[PDB]
Design a protein around this ligand. Structure first.
Ligand SMILES: O=C(O)c1cc(Cl)c(O)c(Cl)c1
Ligand SMILES: O=C(O)c1cc(Cl)c(O)c(Cl)c1
Lengths: 284, 284, 284, 284
């Protein structure tokens, strides 16, 4: 189970050909599960879910998809509301792979994509597990933009190694996780011109007329599946107060909060996160 | 595994002899776990934990203790702050049974007793699992007394079957759980003179000078063990806003919230509650 | 300044003729303010604002409007989502009176009407003062229905005097405000066949396909005017946790909370409310 | 009404001689109010309350006290828990001036001092007005340290002008209030060796064994006076979630929140704050 052995590609149609990179594992397994990664600079499926994919693949057929704008998937210079854009791409990949209704696991940005998908194609998504998700979160107490978003914007404006490190440090409770190796690797991926293309495309997408499609906290009362919200108590990007509207309005919701954990739950609490996910998705 | 096969007694010293009733199960098992029940009228260990004891006893040596004032344990007519009183009784039973440091599972009132115990004898308590606990909860938004406490007080004033049923109905999300059999059984236990003695003793205990010992939300920042807080989103006795101070100030806390669940999590979500407990307490 | 002297009527069109009763005062004053009353059974403009109209009329041209179903306005037996229904009637009265952009003061159900009006006719509403408003509030921690709502429901099913008194008693912090005279006066008004028709009409209106129009917490981010939210800390109908979404998403919001005050802010803290309102609305 | 005309000094005893600087105004007025300033580096009574003292002195006898470590009061290099230290100095000045029970207005760090004083000398403090107070606030959703606190820390380690400007910029919603003149004036005061000694003194004071005295959210349930909490919705130092415990547990509490306002309420909303304060304190 490595990057190379699990690597796959597919071409879907979202206003034209779009190349999606993804990782496939646990192919002999019955239940199919899609993982959607968070949206930092240099973020991709493999680095996001490295402490989780092997474990989940003993029970599930795992599909960890690099979202458009990330990893080795297409980095267009223009797109609409990002979660709708990515959800369309996922709709394409589902139909291609012949998937019917499949549970979604998404953190941060990918959580928003999972949610945006589940609202746009209700019959296609089963249970959702969502770690500090964007979109359905609305910070009732934290002034926006939060510290983490501020630091991300600062990197988008001035893409230096120092700025990138500052941003990664508010991602976690244990700052020792932020090693020189991790910063160098994230920075290399993030400072390529295509990635910079993807960052401008994201920035321009915010001025879009379809901004309302990103405010998914207005819509999640319609979700009929069970939804497991997972949060780090010390999350500085999407703080804990952001969970309240979803927890209240999603009929079959559950919330799990870990203390001494930041934005990257699937890394800082990989083990507890793996079991909660396996158990919630039915054990396989 | 029945009431009768698991039944035991012990005599401890809390200002004199005090008889504690309790249930013992899974005796061949290594890890010892104490269950502390909630504090409704007619409440006891067996009816509280009936959907949980068998399952927990496959992994643990389970001790479900009837608290003084409840079940077949002593119903004194006078006592101090209840959680301290009960925690002293538990200290006595621990020493008698030769228990060292043991994890505590308590709902509602018993959660308060578990917490009061863990603060008073730090070396004696391990991990805590606490379902909608009193004591460490402080309702930041719900005006006090809450609906459930009001209905309990109304029964204490006028102990009729109708009042008892009204109280039991705000205990659960699914009201079908409130059957005529359950009301008749709770009412029979609750309307005996000894139980009525216990209710006055509880009421008089509130006027005590040691009331501060019940405000455990002022003290829980001192807990060093991991604590799992479990809550029903629709809890009408100890509402969800009551969890926030504990979740924030207890260093190694975790919170799990179930939607479509009321005050009796261990009953309405027995299965999910059993697994979370087993997993959190180390699998046995 | 009496009921009869301030009484006025107007006939507007909302799917047919509709008679609106309302009170006019301070006609010599420069600035017009519309008061929209709270929605208990037997409630009307004059009763709701009695400790308020005289004081407000020294600074403002006051129009205190009986909402359809209340006081002497038409009590239809069937209608759609109530706040949109009531806002349509209000829109009609505005055109009739040649009003431009006018500030609205709404208590409870009236608050929802005031807000619904401001969303549906953006150019017609200025500053809002809203006391424990329905509609834009969403109770993030309190389970629905709340205790106050339940009592109202009990009354709709069994409209006895005991039930009305019990409902009014969860309306206020200081229960002495609930005098037998007040109960008797409300019960006289509330038990008329016309009033009970209007009460069932409201209840059936909840099963409507236009329910989304009642969930205004999804829309108030679009409000551009300053909004003053006033809330009593011990409000058992629309609890304080209901204020968070509006406070966060309305750009020019402000919140005032009174301790030792319930749902009836304008009565229990009439003085502080009057001063807060006058100043917020520009001194007049 | 100038700095020099209102300047006064007094010498009190807190483990030795201590010189307190303070400003006195409205001496002809009936009612005495003590203002306690906020605690940035280079902060003092006159600067904190400038848009406020003149207006307040028309109604009240105003005493705006430089807290030890600030302005022209003694800047010791070592002290215990700061609010208790500052309250002891205040207690001394009260006895010196023959004050009875006096209302306190405290901003931020001053708010904590005002509160700590009211708990330690119950008979000496009346009504409190508290703007984004430290101490009784506990941030239930925001991870500590907050963004504002972090910036202050950055300055203590590296007291450059860039760092001071960055700190003042998270103090306010409208950043235009941070003029180069203001930064220059604060930096002049804040970079003196005496000011930096006082700043380190504060930091070392946190490692103290008397830390519990700083956790006033455990104690304010004992406050019997009316307390007005004033908060800015975009406060990034003591965020709005910090108000909940005090608002709930102080029996005669009230809360006012301003949208489009940061940590410096008395500056950014000077007018609304002045009127709110004057009225709350009895018109004088
Ligand atoms: O405004 C009120 O008093 C009110 C209105 C409605 Cl629709 C309601 O259900 C309740 Cl409990 C109160
Ligand atoms: O009052 C303030 O401005 C203040 C006081 C302290 Cl002790 C502090 O750490 C910060 Cl960030 C601000």
């Amino acid at each position: 189970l490595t990057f190379e052995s699990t690597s796959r590609f597919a071409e879907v149609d979202v206003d034209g050909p779009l190349k999606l990179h993804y990782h496939e594992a646990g192919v002999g397994n019955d239940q199919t599960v899609v993982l959607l990664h968070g949206g930092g600079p240099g973020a991709a499926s493999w680095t996001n879910f490295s402490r989780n994919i092997a474990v989940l693949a003993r029970h599930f057929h795992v599909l960890a998809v690099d979202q458009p704008g990330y990893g080795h998937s297409d980095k267009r210079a223009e797109h609409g509301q990002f979660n709708r854009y990515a959800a369309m791409a996922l709709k394409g990949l589902f139909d291609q792979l012949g998937l019917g209704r499949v549970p979604l696991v998404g953190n941060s940005l990918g959580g928003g994509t999972a949610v945006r998908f589940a609202l746009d194609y209700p019959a296609r998504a089963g249970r959702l597990v969502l770690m500090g998700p964007g979109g359905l979160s609305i910070n009732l107490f934290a002034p926006d933009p939060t510290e983490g978003v501020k630091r991300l914007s600062k990197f988008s404006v001035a893409p230096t190694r120092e700025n990138l490190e500052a941003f990664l440090r508010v991602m976690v409770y244990d700052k020792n996780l932020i090693t020189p190796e991790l910063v160098d690797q994230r920075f290399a991926l993030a400072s390529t011109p295509e990635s910079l293309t993807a960052t401008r495309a994201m920035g321009k997408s915010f001025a879009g007329a379809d901004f309302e499609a990103g405010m998914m906290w207005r819509e999640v009362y319609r979700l009929r599946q069970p939804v497991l919200l997972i949060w780090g108590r010390e999350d500085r990007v999407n703080p804990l107060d952001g969970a309240l509207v979803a927890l209240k309005t999603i009929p079959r919701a559950q919330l799990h909060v870990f203390g001494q954990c930041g934005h990257w739950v699937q890394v800082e609490k990989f083990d507890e996160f793996n079991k909660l996910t396996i158990e919630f998705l039915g054990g396989g």
